[PDB]
Amino acid sequence: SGAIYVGNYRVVNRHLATHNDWANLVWEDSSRDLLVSSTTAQGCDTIARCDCQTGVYYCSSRRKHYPVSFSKPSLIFVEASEYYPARYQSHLMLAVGHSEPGDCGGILRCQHGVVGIVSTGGNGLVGFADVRDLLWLDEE
Ligand SMILES: COc1cccc2c1CC[C@H]2N1C[C@@H](C(N)=O)CCC1=O
Ligand SMILES: [Zn+2]
Numbered sequence: 112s113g114a115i116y117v118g119n120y121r122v123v124n125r126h127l128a129t130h131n132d133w134a135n136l137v138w139e140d141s142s143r144d145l146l147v148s149s150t151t152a153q154g155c156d157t158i159a160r161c162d163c164q165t166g167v168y169y170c171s172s173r174r175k176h177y178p179v180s181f182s183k184p185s186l187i188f189v190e191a192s193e194y195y196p197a198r199y200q201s202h203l204m205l206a207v208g209h210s211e212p213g214d215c216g217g218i219l220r221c222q223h224g225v226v227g228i229v230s231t232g233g234n235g236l237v238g239f240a241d242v243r244d245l246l247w248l249d250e251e
Contacts (some may be wrong), residue, residue, distance in 0.1 A: 113169070113216025115225050116154025117248050122147050124215045124230055124240070126194035142201045144194075144230045144240050147248075158248050159223035166221035168229060168237065172211040179206035181219070184241040189231050202241045203230065210237040 115122035123132060125139055125146040132148040139146040164183065167176050184202040191197040192212070204219075210232030217229040219239045231238035242248065 112213065113171070113218065113228060115156050115158075115218065115228060115242065116150065117156045117158055117225070118250075119150050119153060120147050120248055121150050121154070122228065122242060122248070124228065127215060141195075142199075143203075144200060145242070147245075156218075157224040158245070159221050159226045159243055160246075161221060161223045161243065163221035163223065163226065166219050166226055168206070168208065168219040168239065169217035170209055170229075170237075171214050171217055173209060177208055179208050179219075179237070181206040181239065184244070187238065189238070190233070192231075200231065200238070200240075202244070204239045204241055206237050206239070207235060208237040209235070 125144050128146045135148045137147040167178050169176050181204040186199050186201050187203045189200045214229050219226045227239040227241045230240040
C-alpha cells in the first residue's frame, strides 16, 4: 500500500483505490495502473520534473529503501495478476529489486522529488508507474 500526497491530490495504484477515492475522483488510467483523488488537507510530497534513471524506492516487504537504476517509462508486457489480465502497461519503468504484491504504492524518488510508485513485480524485478509527465499535479 501507499500513496503520493501532492497539493490537494492523492495518487494511488488504481487497483488499490478505495470507495472514497472513487467518490472523489480526479483522474484514472487503467493502462498506467494510476488513480488520483482529491484531498481536504494539503500534502508534502513534491513531484520530480526530470529524466533521472537512478533513485531510491521503498520496499514494505523488507522495511527498507533501496537505491536502483531504472529504465525510461515505456510500454511493457506484464503477466496476469489478481488485478489485471496479461497486458501491456504504459509509462512503466523497470529495475532489479525485490517486490511482492503488497509493496505496490511504495515511492520511487530521485534528487528532484517523487518519480513514481511501485506497480508491478516478480522474478527479482520491480516496476514503477511514472508520474513525472503529469504536470497538472503541481497546480489547481
Ligand atoms: C509489486 O507488485 C508485485 C510484486 C510481485 C508480484 C506481483 C506484484 C503485482 C501483482 C503480482 N504479479 C506480478 C505479475 C508480474 N508483473 O510478473 C505476474 C503475476 C503476479 O501475481
Ligand atoms: Zn530526477
